[PDB]
Amino acid sequence: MSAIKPDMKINLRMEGNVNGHHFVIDGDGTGKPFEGKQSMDLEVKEGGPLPFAFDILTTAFNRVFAEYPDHIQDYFKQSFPKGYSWERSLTFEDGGICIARNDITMEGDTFYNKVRFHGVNFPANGPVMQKKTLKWEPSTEKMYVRDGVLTGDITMALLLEGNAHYRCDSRTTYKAKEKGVKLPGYHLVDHCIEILSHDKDYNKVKLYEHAVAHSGLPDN
Amino acid sequence: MSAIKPDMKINLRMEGNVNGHHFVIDGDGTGKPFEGKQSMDLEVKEGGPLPFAFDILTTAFNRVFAEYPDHIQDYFKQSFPKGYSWERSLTFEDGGICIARNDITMEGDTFYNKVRFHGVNFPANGPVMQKKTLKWEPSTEKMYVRDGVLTGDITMALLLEGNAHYRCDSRTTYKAKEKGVKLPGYHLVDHCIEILSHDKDYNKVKLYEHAVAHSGLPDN
Amino acid sequence: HMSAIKPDMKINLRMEGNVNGHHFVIDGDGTGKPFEGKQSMDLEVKEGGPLPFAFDILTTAFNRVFAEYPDHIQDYFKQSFPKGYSWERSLTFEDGGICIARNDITMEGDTFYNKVRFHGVNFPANGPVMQKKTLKWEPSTEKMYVRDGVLTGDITMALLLEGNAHYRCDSRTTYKAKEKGVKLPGYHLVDHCIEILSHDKDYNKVKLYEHAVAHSGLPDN
Amino acid sequence: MSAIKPDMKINLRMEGNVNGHHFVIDGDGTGKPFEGKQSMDLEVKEGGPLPFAFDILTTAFNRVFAEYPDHIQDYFKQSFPKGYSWERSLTFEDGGICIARNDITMEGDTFYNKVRFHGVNFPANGPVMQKKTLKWEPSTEKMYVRDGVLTGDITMALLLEGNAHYRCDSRTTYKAKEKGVKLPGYHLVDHCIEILSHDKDYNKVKLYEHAVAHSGLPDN
Numbered sequence: 001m002s003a004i005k006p007d008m009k010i011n012l013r014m015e016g017n018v019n020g021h022h023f024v025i026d027g028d029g030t031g032k033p034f035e036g037k038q039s040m041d042l043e044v045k046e047g048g049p050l051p052f053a054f055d056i057l058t059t060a061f062n063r064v065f066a067e068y069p070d071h072i073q074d075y076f077k078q079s080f081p082k083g084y085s086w087e088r089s090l091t092f093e094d095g096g097i098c099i100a101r102n103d104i105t106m107e108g109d110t111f112y113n114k115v116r117f118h119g120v121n122f123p124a125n126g127p128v129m130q131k132k133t134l135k136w137e138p139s140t141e142k143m144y145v146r147d148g149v150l151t152g153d154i155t156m157a158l159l160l161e162g163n164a165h166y167r168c169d170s171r172t173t174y175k176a177k178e179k180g181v182k183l184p185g186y187h188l189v190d191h192c193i194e195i196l197s198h199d200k201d202y203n204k205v206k207l208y209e210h211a212v213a214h215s216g217l218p219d220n
Numbered sequence: 221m222s223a224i225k226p227d228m229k230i231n232l233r234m235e236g237n238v239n240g241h242h243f244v245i246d247g248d249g250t251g252k253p254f255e256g257k258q259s260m261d262l263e264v265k266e267g268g269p270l271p272f273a274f275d276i277l278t279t280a281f282n283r284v285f286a287e288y289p290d291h292i293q294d295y296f297k298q299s300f301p302k303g304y305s306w307e308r309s310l311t312f313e314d315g316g317i318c319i320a321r322n323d324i325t326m327e328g329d330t331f332y333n334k335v336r337f338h339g340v341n342f343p344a345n346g347p348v349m350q351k352k353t354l355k356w357e358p359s360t361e362k363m364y365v366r367d368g369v370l371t372g373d374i375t376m377a378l379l380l381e382g383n384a385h386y387r388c389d390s391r392t393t394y395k396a397k398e399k400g401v402k403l404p405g406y407h408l409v410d411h412c413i414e415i416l417s418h419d420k421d422y423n424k425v426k427l428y429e430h431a432v433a434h435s436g437l438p439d440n
Numbered sequence: 441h442m443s444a445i446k447p448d449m450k451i452n453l454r455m456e457g458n459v460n461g462h463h464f465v466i467d468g469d470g471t472g473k474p475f476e477g478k479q480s481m482d483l484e485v486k487e488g489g490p491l492p493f494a495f496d497i498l499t500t501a502f503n504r505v506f507a508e509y510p511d512h513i514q515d516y517f518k519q520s521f522p523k524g525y526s527w528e529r530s531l532t533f534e535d536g537g538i539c540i541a542r543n544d545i546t547m548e549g550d551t552f553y554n555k556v557r558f559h560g561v562n563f564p565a566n567g568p569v570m571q572k573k574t575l576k577w578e579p580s581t582e583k584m585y586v587r588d589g590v591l592t593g594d595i596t597m598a599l600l601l602e603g604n605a606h607y608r609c610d611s612r613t614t615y616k617a618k619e620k621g622v623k624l625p626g627y628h629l630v631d632h633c634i635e636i637l638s639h640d641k642d643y644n645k646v647k648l649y650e651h652a653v654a655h656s657g658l659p660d661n
Numbered sequence: 662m663s664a665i666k667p668d669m670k671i672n673l674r675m676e677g678n679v680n681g682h683h684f685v686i687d688g689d690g691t692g693k694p695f696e697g698k699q700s701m702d703l704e705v706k707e708g709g710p711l712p713f714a715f716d717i718l719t720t721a722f723n724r725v726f727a728e729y730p731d732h733i734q735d736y737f738k739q740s741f742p743k744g745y746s747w748e749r750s751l752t753f754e755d756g757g758i759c760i761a762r763n764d765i766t767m768e769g770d771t772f773y774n775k776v777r778f779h780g781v782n783f784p785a786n787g788p789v790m791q792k793k794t795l796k797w798e799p800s801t802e803k804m805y806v807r808d809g810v811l812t813g814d815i816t817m818a819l820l821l822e823g824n825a826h827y828r829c830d831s832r833t834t835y836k837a838k839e840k841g842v843k844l845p846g847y848h849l850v851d852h853c854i855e856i857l858s859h860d861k862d863y864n865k866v867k868l869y870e871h872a873v874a875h876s877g878l879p880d881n
């Protein structure tokens with residue numbers, strides 16, 4: 001009491017537009033906030049089949065699901081029950097640019113996610129519009145405070161078919177709903193994200209993430 | 221050929237969300253497509269007073285309004301009567317990122333503009349959230365083709381209080397609705413945009429743009 | 441004060457640099473008309489020739505004194521003389537190539553002297569620079585403004601490539617007068633066009649030309 | 662008969678120019694390649710006292726010093742005895758940009774390093790020219806292949822006095838001298854780097870780095 005339980009449910013609704021293509025996607029899942037693990041079943045409700053790589057959406061589908069050790073302030077679990085919100089930009093190396101936001105709330109044992117995602121300027125023959133991506137490689141998010149706001153920057157990479165990589169820089173700004181939530185010091189958060197399964201058109205996808213916060217070398 | 225008249229009316233509808241603040245803005249104006257001039261009266265219908273600098277929105281409020289000389293293919297006038305659409309990213313120097321789009325159609329003597337605008341990651345004490353902007357400086361858009369699509373990049377700058385400047389890079393991708401509209405060669409488009417007047421909170425704004433296409437030195 | 445800049449000036453230039461780990465030295469001798477914003481220069485690779493990279497990436501490094509300034513815009517560059525000024529520049533190419541360059545500019549009599557350095561890193565082996573697939577810079581427009589108390593010019597640039605694709609490069613130059621008391625200009629634009637008029641097969645010898653004109657943008661330009 | 666020995670020496674010379682200020686700096690160190698730990702004593706031979714934050718130079722003062730696990734190809738240890746070279750760009754958030762190069766060779770138990778470092782466009786009032794930096798935060802370098810070349814991208818941050826942070830993006834390209842050195846798959850390398858001690862003007866500096874390669878979650 002102690003808002004967050006060892007096992008939580010996850011309800012998510014994303015709406016968005018990439019390349020002028022509108023879509024709506026519902027998510028239903030479960031996770032273990034204290035182990036930093038979560039899974040979700042996603043369903044394209046409108047806009048299917050998506051004309052673009054589903055992978056660009058997957059980080060938009062909650063840093064509550066991250067294992068924080070005792071020596072690092074856990075801004076995210078501290079933000080409940082009132083919750084918090086985040087904004088993000090994704091800057092892909094070929095000019096594709098996405099913005100996204102999620103307003104995260106909690107009712108009982110369930111997190112609710114209102115997610116918006118917009119992508120512009122993706123080249124027609126790029127790996128995104130040609131759906132040539134395989135997965136995100138595991139990443140490390142750098143967490144720091146800027147102008148009063150917890151900020152996470154990430155150098156990300158999509159593995160492509162033919163074993164090339166496709167670079168994307170992510171900046172996320174995280175804001176507790178409640179006044180006064182103490183900001184953490186600089187720290188790192190390892191991520192790995194995986195589409196465990198999906199149908200042909202990616203109208204149905206099962207997503208998994210694992211995340212662990214740490215202080216970097218040599219204290220990790 | 222185009223059915224674009226020397227004098228046209230402009231109907232505009234924008235919806236958007238900056239920093240989590242949703243808004244709706246209507247525009248009604250008139251322009252001279254062949255003189256590359258237009259003006260518009262904008263009214264904030266929802267979300268007023270805006271908590272952010274109105275200037276960030278104004279380039280989203282149609283390159284049909286640009287004087288094109290004979291020796292340069294005019295992709296925009298050649299796109300009608302069927303019309304065209306664009307997507308844009310605005311990358312501000314302090315991490316603020318916006319995306320925008322506009323679907324442009326024509327019915328008789330009126331252009332219709334369905335515009336969307338999203339902005340994320342603006343710092344609380346930056347010139348945008350603190351409304352320290354004065355105007356966009358006159359600019360020059362660099363037009364070229366990339367992956368089969370007409371693309372415009374601009375080095376933009378907002379004049380700020382005290383005559384400092386706040387930099388923003390714009391990339392716009394332009395796509396004619398009808399197939400096989402001939403793409404132009406590399407060229408430049410000069411722009412100047414100005415808020416001619418506005419009320420205290422910028423719920424009401426009169427906007428003007430002048431744009432002229434040219435080939436650069438030594439010609440221009 | 442009187443600039444001591446004549447309508448017809450000589451240009452002496454010395455570049456040294458390193459791109460992709462390849463060292464080079466290039467000399468330049470040219471002439472120009474500061475008030476007309478036009479200049480031409482004959483360049484000769486003295487060391488490291490033949491260059492294994494596109495000569496074009498070097499050409500903007502080969503002096504905003506050579507820009508026609510109208511009377512209503514403060515001319516920081518001509519006012520920097522006789523003492524002179526220096527600039528530093530970053531070039532950020534869309535495929536990861538990054539160059540930095542500097543020029544220290546002085547004047548003796550009818551001649552500008554230029555000590556130029558140029559370093560480029562992270563150009564991919566099969567990109568248009570290492571493969572020498574560039575044709576020219578397209579005409580550009582430099583945005584001039586005071587940033588952190590220093591006149592700065594930002595530019596969206598584009599190299600035409602063979603196959604008529606374009607290759608994007610963003611430029612930022614910082615310009616600093618050597619002498620105190622040089623008035624800073626308000627925001628303005630400088631149109632450029634730069635052209636290799638001729639070259640020998642390996643670009644060991646190159647004739648370069650530039651035309652530049654400052655203006656206030658629309659609606660009065 | 663291995664080229665890499667458990668305890669090795671490091672001889673280094675850097676020459677460079679930041680904001681027009683020329684400098685020469687010699688380094689003499691020792692390290693343990695297999696444990697990814699090294700220390701070096703640096704001495705400014707020319708250009709002291711440096712007018713800029715010594716911290717911008719420290720990553721330029723060899724990925725052979727990284728603990729590589731068996732399941733990740735170790736490109737750097739495989740590059741000896743002949744050696745390898747790297748080029749780097751450092752893009753700071755306020756427009757300061759640096760490039761650096763190191764040509765690394767080996768004789769007996771000693772690595773030799775020919776290092777060059779050039780920085781431009783640092784603002785006079787910024788934390789580099791004001792010497793307001795305290796340290797690099799621990800980081801994670803993302804290693805991947807692009808156009809045949811091992812490439813490392815890093816989201817870096819300098820902690821500043823007052824506990825603000827100053828962001829810098831690093832790209833390094835690494836090239837074995839010898840033909841036929843096998844490229845590794847995608848992986849991460851954790852770093853931490855620390856000035857253990859220095860005299861008042863940073864004419865003398867003792868530097869330490871620890872680095873460890875890993876596969877990220879869930880392995881790590």
Ligand SMILES: O=S([O-])[O-]
Pocket residue numbers: 192193194195208209210211878879
């Ligand atoms: O937790 S990872 O295997 O997507």
Ligand SMILES: O=S([O-])[O-]
Pocket residue numbers: 411412413414415428429430431658659
């Ligand atoms: O089109 S300009 O005169 O604001």
Ligand SMILES: O=S([O-])[O-]
Pocket residue numbers: 437438633634635636649650651
């Ligand atoms: O005057 S320009 O075509 O070098």
Ligand SMILES: O=S([O-])[O-]
Pocket residue numbers: 217218853854855869870871
């Ligand atoms: O080199 S590490 O101990 O910050």
